[PDB]
Amino acid sequence: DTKEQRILRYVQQNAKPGDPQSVLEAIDTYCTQKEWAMNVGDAKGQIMDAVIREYSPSLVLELGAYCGYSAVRMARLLQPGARLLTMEMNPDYAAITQQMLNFAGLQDKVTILNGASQDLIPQLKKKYDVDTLDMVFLDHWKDRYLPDTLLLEKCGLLRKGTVLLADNVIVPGTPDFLAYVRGSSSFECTHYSSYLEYMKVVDGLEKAIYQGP
Ligand SMILES: O=C(NC/C=C/[C@H]1O[C@@H](n2cnc3c(NCCO)ncnc32)[C@H](O)[C@@H]1O)c1cc(-c2ccc(F)cc2)cc(O)c1O
Numbered sequence: 434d435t436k437e438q439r440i441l442r443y444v445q446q447n448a449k450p451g452d453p454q455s456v457l458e459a460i461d462t463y464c465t466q467k468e469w470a471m472n473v474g475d476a477k478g479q480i481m482d483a484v485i486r487e488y489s490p491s492l493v494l495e496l497g498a499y500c501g502y503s504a505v506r507m508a509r510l511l512q513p514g515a516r517l518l519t520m521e522m523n524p525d526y527a528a529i530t531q532q533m534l535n536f537a538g539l540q541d542k543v544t545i546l547n548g549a550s551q552d553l554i555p556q557l558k559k560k561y562d563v564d565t566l567d568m569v570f571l572d573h574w575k576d577r578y579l580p581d582t583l584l585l586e587k588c589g590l591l592r593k594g595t596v597l598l599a600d601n602v603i604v605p606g607t608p609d610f611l612a613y614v615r616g617s618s619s620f621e622c623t624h625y626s627s628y629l630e631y632m633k634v635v636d637g638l639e640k641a642i643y644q645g646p
C-alpha cells in the first residue's frame with residue numbers, strides 16, 4: 434500500500450472517531466515517528482488555527498487536500514453553518530481525505546471535490562452556488578498558486594477582504610506568487626515565519642488580503 438493509505442490506516446487503528454484533535458495528533462505522531470508526509474503540520478497548523486479563529490470565515494476554499502489534515506484543522510474551527518470546499522485532483526488522495534473527514538465527524542461541514550482546480554474553479558458559481566469566498570488556503574503544486582489566484586479573481590470569486598493563506602512560501606517556495614502578491618496594490622500581505630512540517634527547517638505562511646480591483 435501507499436504512505437497515504439498507511440497514514441489513514443494508522444489513524445483508523447489508533448485515533449478516536451468524531452474527535453478531530455485526536456485525528457490531528459495521530460497524524461502528527463505518525464509523521465514524526467514513522468514516515469514524513471507533506472501535511473501542513475502542527476507548527477504552521479497553529480498559525481492557521483489563529484487565522485481561522487480571527488476571521489471567522491463562512492466559506493473557505495482549499496486547493497490541494499492531500500490526506501485531509503488541513504481540512505480537519507480548518508473545519509473543526511468553523512462556526513455552525515460555515516463550510517469548507519476542498520479540491521484534490523488525485524483520486525486516491527481525494528478518497529483518503531473524504532474518509533479522514535468522515536472519521537473526524539466533519540463530513541457535513543466539508544465538500545471534497547475530486548478534480549483539478551483549474552477545471553473546478555470556473556464551476557463554483559453555477560454548479561456549487563458559490564457567490565464569493567471568505568478565505569482560500571493554497572497548498573497544491575507551488576507553480577499553480579499564482580495561476581489559480583488570477584483565475585479566482587477572473588471568475589469573480591474574490592471580494593474585498595477575502596483572505597488568501599499560502600503554505601510553503603519558503604520551502605519549497607512559490608516565488609512568482611509571493612513576488613506578485615507583495616508587489617500588488619490589490620493585496621495586503623503579512624508573513625508568518627514558521628517551520629516545515631515535522632522538520633527543523635524554516636518555512637512560512639503568507640496571508641494576502643484581497644483589496645478589490
Ligand atoms: O509539493 C508540495 N505540495 C504539493 C501538493 C500537492 C497536493 O495537491 C494536489 N494537487 C496538486 N495540484 C492540484 C490542483 N491543481 C493544479 C494542478 O492542475 N488541483 C487540485 N489538487 C491539486 C496533489 O494531488 C496533492 O494532494 C509540498 C511539498 C513540501 C516539501 C518540502 C520539503 C521537501 F523536501 C519536500 C517537499 C512541503 C509541503 O508542505 C507541500 O505542500
Ligand SMILES: [Cl-]
Pocket residue numbers: 471472473474498499500501502503504
Ligand atoms: Cl495538509
Ligand SMILES: [Cl-]
Pocket residue numbers: 473474475476477629630631632
Ligand atoms: Cl510540525
Ligand SMILES: [Mg+2]
Pocket residue numbers: 471472473572600601
Ligand atoms: Mg504544504
